Amino acid sequence: YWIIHSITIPALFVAGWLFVSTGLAYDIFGTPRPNEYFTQERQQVPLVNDRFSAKQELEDLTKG
Amino acid sequence: RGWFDLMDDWLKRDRFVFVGWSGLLLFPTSYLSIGGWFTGTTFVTSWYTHGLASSYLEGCNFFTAAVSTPANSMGHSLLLLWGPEAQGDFTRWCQIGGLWAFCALHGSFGLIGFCLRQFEIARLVGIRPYNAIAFSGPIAIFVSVFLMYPLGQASWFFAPSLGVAAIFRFLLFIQGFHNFTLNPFHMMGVAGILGAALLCAIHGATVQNTIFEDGDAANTFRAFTPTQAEETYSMVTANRFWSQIFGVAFSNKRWLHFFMLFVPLAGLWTSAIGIVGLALNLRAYDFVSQELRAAEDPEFETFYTKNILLNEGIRSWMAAQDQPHENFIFPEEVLPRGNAL
Amino acid sequence: PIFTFRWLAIHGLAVPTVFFLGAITSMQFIQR
Amino acid sequence: KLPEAYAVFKPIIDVAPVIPVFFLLLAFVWQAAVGFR
Amino acid sequence: EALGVDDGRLLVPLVLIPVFIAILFSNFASTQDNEDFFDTYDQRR
Amino acid sequence: MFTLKIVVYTTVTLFVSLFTFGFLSNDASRNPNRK
Amino acid sequence: AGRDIESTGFAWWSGNSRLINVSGKLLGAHVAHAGLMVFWCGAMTLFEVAHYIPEKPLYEQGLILLPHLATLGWGVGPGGEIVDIYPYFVVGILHIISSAVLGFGGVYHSLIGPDTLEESFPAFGYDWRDKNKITTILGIHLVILGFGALLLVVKAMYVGGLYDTWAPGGGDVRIIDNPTLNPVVIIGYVLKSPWGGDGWIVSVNNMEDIVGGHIWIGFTCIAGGFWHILTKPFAWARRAYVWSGEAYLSYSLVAVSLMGFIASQYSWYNNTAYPSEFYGPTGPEASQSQAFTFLVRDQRLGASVASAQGPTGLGKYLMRSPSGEIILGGETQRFWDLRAPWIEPLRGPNGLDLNKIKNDIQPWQERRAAEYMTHAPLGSFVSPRSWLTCAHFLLGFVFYIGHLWHAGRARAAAAGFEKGINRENEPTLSLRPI
Amino acid sequence: SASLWERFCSWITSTDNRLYIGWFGVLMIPTLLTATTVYIIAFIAAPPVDIDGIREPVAGSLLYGNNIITGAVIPSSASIGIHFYPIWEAASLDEWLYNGGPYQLIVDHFLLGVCGWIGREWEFSYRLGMRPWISVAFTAPVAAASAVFLVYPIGQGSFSDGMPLGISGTFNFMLVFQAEHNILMHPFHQLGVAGVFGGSLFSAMHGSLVTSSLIRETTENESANYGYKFGQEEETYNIVAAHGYFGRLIFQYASFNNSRALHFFLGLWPVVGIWFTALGIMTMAFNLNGFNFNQSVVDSQGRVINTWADILNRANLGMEVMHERNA
Amino acid sequence: MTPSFSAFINSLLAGLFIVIIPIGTALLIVSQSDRL
Amino acid sequence: METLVYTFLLIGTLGVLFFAVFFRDPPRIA
Ligand code: CLA
Ligand code: CLA
Ligand code: CLA
Ligand SMILES: CC1=CCCC(C)(C)[C@H]1/C=C/C(C)=C/C=C/C(C)=C/C=C/C=C(C)/C=C/C=C(C)/C=C/C1=C(C)CCCC1(C)C
Ligand SMILES: CC1=CCCC(C)(C)[C@H]1/C=C/C(C)=C/C=C/C(C)=C/C=C/C=C(C)/C=C/C=C(C)/C=C/C1=C(C)CCCC1(C)C
Ligand SMILES: CC1=CCCC(C)(C)[C@H]1/C=C/C(C)=C/C=C/C(C)=C/C=C/C=C(C)/C=C/C=C(C)/C=C/C1=C(C)CCCC1(C)C
Ligand SMILES: [Cl-]
Ligand SMILES: [Cl-]
Ligand SMILES: [Fe+2]
Ligand SMILES: [Mn+2]
Ligand SMILES: [Mn+2]
């Protein structure tokens, strides 16, 4: 029990730590970093306007 | 035996956690709903749907983190990951609020699975299924509030977001835009919930204070054993106490426990009826006679009119940030205020 | 032993739980 | 601020007021030690 | 001031009524056995 | 207003005195286990 | 054994209930708790003096014991300014060192001391039913409390004096030369109405009344202690009370619950025993100070829609009280009962006099009003008065709950049905129905 | 029997009365009856009350244009504050009615009556020889009523801040309290919400488990409630069956095998919740408000990124400006 | 033919081969293996 | 006129409470 759990558990904790510290969470989940809430061209709140062009609209909004 | 019989035998085995046939629906759906809620409150943002930060990654705490509802641009879309809105892109699906739809749908199916689990365990044990009928209360609450209300409204956007501060915002938003406190069905729901809490407290105190002296110890929890053919508390003493203190008292234990079951269930179902009424903006918002009296008499004021003014304040001072898709821009002159009324 | 319902449910709870605990602990040391 | 001679003993003093709470916890630990008899 | 007593007549109910009831209570008190008992409460009544 | 005040004072004093002297009348002995 | 449910009938979570019928361990537990209280006092005093910033006032740093020490006159000069924190350090050191002695005494009398006292020390033993001995102990501790009150009196009149907010030109450490020993004033304070405008004992607004009342309390406690030592409870008292440890505990619980409510109201309203230079202004004080600051800024200059007597009948921020007196107008009208040192010289027989505010105003009054306007318990920062009031109100409520619980259980245990209904002779089965 | 006072004491503490009176009832019945009749008379025909003290009365009576929902006994005038305002302390009866004196009368007599009810519950428990802690359970709604009627006006300094004796007045009290103090973010109101929700859940669960495991003592042509006879010595439901069902619905460890412990928990949970929410109301009466998470998220440039707490604060601000008729 | 319908068909296939088939196969294997 | 209906309903409810208290089915041991 403790033999396996002395290796798997800390490694999993470190992996969870690195999922945030390396910035992979922002890329995977699309969460904006603190320096990319407002772009230079768009100083307003970005909101999706059409449901069927949502992917392209988000690509345009998150391109910068 | 056949394959179906063997699978039924295996699913019915007395393990630490009962699985059953209903487990095949309950466990994956409930697990996915809970995991999706944790993922949304931990990583997924609401910046592109509500213009809000709701995640631990963005700096929110337990109260302010939420799985926010989808964008108002989406209608009542199922928001499937493979659907035309996301087209298989996980990042865009999370950004448009598809995780809320994931949690809501898999959670509704998890509630159905848990109700079926209650039915199945009641059938196997050999008791009446008065559970999964009590749970119909919470099922109706969830269906009316998280499913029927947004379906009656413009989109999923106006559904409650899965968070503490989000739920508080939903409460205040519904009060402002519907005057839900004035709704009689909500009043019956409040009466049911408060009466159920009253019944729980009073029944617990009554049983604890009418126990038979079945032990020599001052602490009386040891005096009870489950294999008892005798009642552990005096029903006659309790009936006499409440009949000469309150004027009326229970004399039938079965009726008392059925009543303790019935009050919260009836309250929840009445509140569900009220929320279904709210879903179509069919609200008991105002009394026409009182409005007419206040219009032709500036010196006529009641607490109902003050509540109407308060609801107007919530609507105007929250519309701009609570519905960013509408692009509401209200100048300070048009904003209602107590001064210059 | 290797595979049991209790074992699988426990790990399905725990492997994300420890991952999320690590993620939140990392979030605690973000510059924010 | 503490006097000049007693400044370096600021940390332990900062720990000092929350000691009674630990006493309560200590009682529970004692009840945990004897098996809650 | 005092016990809300801004008029002297208000002192008449505040004294005569407690005394009168006390007199009735006296008829109770003289009837009871007023010796020591060395117990949590006195069962003699 | 004075007559209402004196009536209220009379009533309150009467009820408070009844309460006080009733709980002074060996109230603990008024239990079913008293012998 | 006496330390388990098998031999006592009490579980671990009710385990101190096993201390009711053993005297030595009960004494040790009480001495240990006293040591805990003294340790907290000393440690928190050291913590507060370790975090004291000289430029900030006491009430802006979240300090509650340093204001108590400053009200006694230690380390405070004119105007409420703090000169040195060394006496506060000495107080904390003395409490935290006596805590070690008290803790050793509690540990000794609890662990290795005799479980019962009467078999070895008959002068200290008791039965919870020997009324004479319990009254003797009550009288001794009453004498101790009276001597403590007289010690406060001696501090007030002889050793340094007490801080007074009502001294001219701001508060100062003053020797209370002539306390109010007249029984009429003290009895009127005790019998005063507790509602708005009267305030019962919370409304004592001068140090002389405080010192005289504490003189009366100390001497009365000494006399009552000697009385209870030399007397036995009368027939009316013997038949009315339950004579057991839990009953006495419940009596103490309701007493301290009422005391906690009184102390919360004292911290919220009183600014004489709780100076505003140490505890901050009260809510009414802050509201009236904001109104007074606005009135002053209207009298000076006059561009705030108030340049003459044209607005209202009186000047701006002025109106008449329900009894006709002149008070500050606006939302602060509900706080017209406030009496504060910075506003008393501006108040006359009819209330606030406009010309007296115009001419007889002092700069220190304006500074006090502005600094109290900045820090408002209600709003315009969590006030120390708010913390004290909320904490002791909660404590009073929960100790009323404890009194109800312990009194009900004492009655049930004395009668003999606290463990349940006998089931052999059920009381309601003998009563006729309806 | 021995004396006239002894006969009076025997009648007062008699268990043969239809409703037990007792010494606590000697104070409870007059105060409760007075408050009841004054409340009925005020709800039917009271004049409008200048609650804000700026000579604009607010109507709350049926005869002045209110229904049951909108009718209320308006709190006392803000000019009164928390001054004691009986009938004899007013210049005229019209002045007493205009300043909300009946509100003070009803509140004071009702608080005395509920204290007497607590004491009377204890008294009849002692008379019947049962355990006395039902009154401890009843302290929680009494605490809540005293907090919303007495403690909050004391902390705020005016009985006008107390909860109006009505439905719409109660809603107005809730909305103004949320605006002023943000009670939703207060952890003690959260504990109270948990208490009431858990009380409803546990009442429903206990009722379901007892009704589900009812022992068959009846036929199909009659109600199952007749399977239980008043005063019977046997248990009407199988505790073992309900315990097994509950321990199979969740994992086996989570179950209340002891019925006495289960009922103690049932009594404890909502009482503790209501105690906590009453304590929260008392603390917020002295401006110990709830959590403030406003402007908790900012970007690199320093612009505030709103959260749901910001939307809640916007709603609170929208209520606040409407409540304050002054600047 | 549209991308939405292709996504729907692929969703049916994924629900069959990732949810229904694996869970059903495991349930059958464990049930038949453990006849108790 | 609606005030009459409101008062009638309230008085009827109070009377129902009175009759439920003082004219209930008397409990007996069976
Ligand atoms: C401040 C609160 C307080 C106090 C003063 C006491 C005191 C006491 N309890 Mg109570 N108790 C408390 C809280 C308290 N308890 C709580 C919260 C619980 C619930 C968990 C209990 C549960 C409980 C039970 C179940 C029982 C007691 C008993 C006792 C007595 C003897 C305990 C014993 O055998 O020690 C044994 C403990 C030890 C040997 C380990 C601790 C050693 C010492 C005390 C640690 C002190 C540390 C301190 C820094 C040392 C200072 C040294 C000095 C020179 C400066 C003693 C009078 C018992 C008794 O006498 O009943 C008849 C008993 O049966 N208590
Ligand atoms: C902590 C202190 C304390 C304690 C516990 C006791 C306890 C006792 N005393 Mg002692 N006593 C004390 C201090 C104390 N006394 C002091 C300081 C004095 C000097 C005045 C006396 C003088 C004294 C005498 C002369 C007698 C007692 C008696 C008694 C017994 C019954 C008392 C009773 O029923 O109250 C009855 C209480 C009342 C009738 C209420 C009177 C309240 C007065 C009018 C002031 C009201 C203030 C305010 C308006 C209302 C309370 C407000 C509150 C929030 C503060 C009891 C053993 C009697 C006994 O049997 O012993 C021989 C007795 O005859 N005591
Ligand atoms: C001076 C005050 C005082 C005294 C001496 C007693 C003494 C006693 N009480 Mg009473 N009681 C009091 C106040 C008091 N009580 C108050 C104010 C309340 C209301 C809350 C109660 C409610 C109460 C009940 C309901 C019961 C007692 C019981 C008892 C007995 C056993 C206590 C025990 O073993 O504790 C054991 C100690 C614990 C289990 C620890 C509890 C810890 C609490 C819940 C935490 C509270 C928050 C904490 C302070 C914050 C610290 C944070 C930390 C956790 C990190 C004993 C005779 C019991 C008994 O046997 O009756 C005779 C019993 O059933 N009391
Ligand atoms: C200290 C503290 C105080 C109070 C007491 C306390 C509460 C106990 C304690 C708290 C302690 C704490 C902080 C406890 C916190 C514990 C935590 C954070 C547990 C997290 C669990 C995460 C899960 C289950 C996510 C699973 C992800 C899934 C299923 C992914 C689903 C996917 C999504 C996105 C959708 C697409 C499909 C797939 C790909 C399947
Ligand atoms: C009985 C009981 C049974 C079981 C349950 C139980 C609750 C666990 C137990 C209770 C046990 C209990 C409650 C035991 C009670 C224990 C207590 C209260 C012990 C007090 C210790 C205080 C000390 C040593 C401080 C000394 C201060 C000094 C040296 C000051 C120094 C300063 C100087 C000189 C100059 C400045 C710097 C500093 C350093 C600040
Ligand atoms: C008999 C009886 C009836 C029936 C029930 C029963 C239980 C059987 C029993 C109950 C008995 C009960 C309930 C008995 C309880 C009775 C109570 C609560 C008596 C309170 C006494 C307090 C006094 C005299 C305050 C004195 C304060 C002073 C002088 C303050 C001075 C001040 C100082 C120090 C500081 C400055 C301010 C001033 C104000 C100047
Ligand atoms: Cl203002
Ligand atoms: Cl309002
Ligand atoms: Fe039950
Ligand atoms: Mn207010
Ligand atoms: Mn407001």
TrEMBL record, chain B:
The chain crosses the membrane at residues 16-38, 99-117, 129-149, 155-173, 185-205, 255-280. A plastoquinone binds at H203, F250. GO terms for molecular function: chlorophyll binding; electron transfer activity; iron ion binding; oxidoreductase activity. GO terms for biological process: photosynthetic electron transport in photosystem II. CDD domains: Photosystem-II_D2. It holds the Pfam family Photo_RC. Coiled coil: none annotated. Chlorophyll a binds at L81, H106. Chlorophyll a PD2 binds at H186. Keywords: Chlorophyll, Chloroplast, Chromophore, Electron transport, Iron, Magnesium, Membrane, Metal-binding, Oxidoreductase, Photosynthesis, Photosystem II, Plastid, Thylakoid, Transmembrane, Transmembrane helix, Transport. 2 of the reaction center chlorophylls (ChlD1 and ChlD2) are entirely coordinated by water. This is Photosystem II D2 protein.
Automatic annotation (TrEMBL), chain C:
It is a single-pass membrane protein. With its partner (PsbE) binds heme. PSII binds additional chlorophylls, carotenoids and specific lipids. The chain crosses the membrane at residues 10-30. GO terms for cellular component: chloroplast thylakoid membrane; photosystem II reaction center. Residues 1-22 form the Photosystem II cytochrome b559 N-terminal domain. It is found in: Membrane; Plastid, Chloroplast thylakoid membrane. This b-type cytochrome is tightly associated with the reaction center of photosystem II (PSII). PSII is a light-driven water:plastoquinone oxidoreductase that uses light energy to abstract electrons from H(2)O, generating O(2) and a proton gradient subsequently used for ATP formation. It consists of a core antenna complex that captures photons, and an electron transfer chain that converts photonic excitation into a charge separation. Heterodimer of an alpha subunit and a beta subunit. PSII is composed of 1 copy each of membrane proteins PsbA, PsbB, PsbC, PsbD, PsbE, PsbF, PsbH, PsbI, PsbJ, PsbK, PsbL, PsbM, PsbT, PsbX, PsbY, PsbZ, Psb30/Ycf12, at least 3 peripheral proteins of the oxygen-evolving complex and a large number of cofactors. It forms dimeric complexes. This is Cytochrome b559 subunit beta. It comes from Rhodomonas salina (Pyrenomonas salina). The chain holds residues 11 to 42 of 42 of the full protein.
Automatic annotation (TrEMBL), chain D:
It is found in: Membrane; Plastid, Chloroplast thylakoid membrane. The keyword Thylakoid applies. It is a single-pass membrane protein. Keywords: Chloroplast, Membrane, Photosynthesis, Photosystem II, Plastid, Reaction center, Thylakoid, Transmembrane, Transmembrane helix. GO terms for biological process: photosynthesis. GO terms for cellular component: chloroplast thylakoid membrane; photosystem II reaction center. The keyword Transmembrane helix applies. The chain crosses the membrane at residues 17-36. It comes from the Eukaryota. Belongs to the PsbK family. One of the components of the core complex of photosystem II (PSII). PSII is a light-driven water:plastoquinone oxidoreductase that uses light energy to abstract electrons from H(2)O, generating O(2) and a proton gradient subsequently used for ATP formation. It consists of a core antenna complex that captures photons, and an electron transfer chain that converts photonic excitation into a charge separation. PSII is composed of 1 copy each of membrane proteins PsbA, PsbB, PsbC, PsbD, PsbE, PsbF, PsbH, PsbI, PsbJ, PsbK, PsbL, PsbM, PsbT, PsbX, PsbY, PsbZ, Psb30/Ycf12, at least 3 peripheral proteins of the oxygen-evolving complex and a large number of cofactors. It forms dimeric complexes. This is Photosystem II reaction center protein K. The gene is psbK.
Automatic annotation (TrEMBL), chain G:
Chlorophyll a 4 binds at H33. It is found in: Membrane; Plastid, Chloroplast thylakoid membrane. Chlorophyll a 6 binds at H68, Y274, H392. Chlorophyll a 2 binds at N16, R18. Chlorophyll a 9 binds at H214. The chain crosses the membrane at residues 27-46, 88-113, 134-158, 215-236, 248-269. [CaMn4O5] cluster binds at E344. Chlorophyll a 5 binds at C41, H95. It is a multi-pass membrane protein. Chlorophyll a 7 binds at Y108, H109. Keywords: Acetylation, Chlorophyll, Chloroplast, Chromophore, Manganese, Membrane, Metal-binding, Phosphoprotein, Photosynthesis, Photosystem II, Plastid, Signal, Thylakoid, Transmembrane, Transmembrane helix. Chlorophyll a 1 binds at S14, N16, S17, H406. Chlorophyll a 3 binds at H30, S252. Pfam families: PSII (PF00421). One of its GO terms (biological process) is photosynthetic electron transport in photosystem II. One of its GO terms (molecular function) is chlorophyll binding. Chlorophyll a 10 binds at H228, F234, Y241. Chlorophyll a 8 binds at H141. The keyword Kinase does not apply. GO terms for cellular component: chloroplast thylakoid membrane; photosystem II. PSII is composed of 1 copy each of membrane proteins PsbA, PsbB, PsbC, PsbD, PsbE, PsbF, PsbH, PsbI, PsbJ, PsbK, PsbL, PsbM, PsbT, PsbX, PsbY, PsbZ, Ycf12, at least 3 peripheral proteins of the oxygen-evolving complex and a large number of cofactors. It forms dimeric complexes. Belongs to the PsbB/PsbC family. PsbC subfamily. One of the components of the core complex of photosystem II (PSII). It binds chlorophyll and helps catalyze the primary light-induced photochemical processes of PSII. PSII is a light-driven water:plastoquinone oxidoreductase, using light energy to abstract electrons from H(2)O, generating O(2) and a proton gradient subsequently used for ATP formation. The gene is psbC.
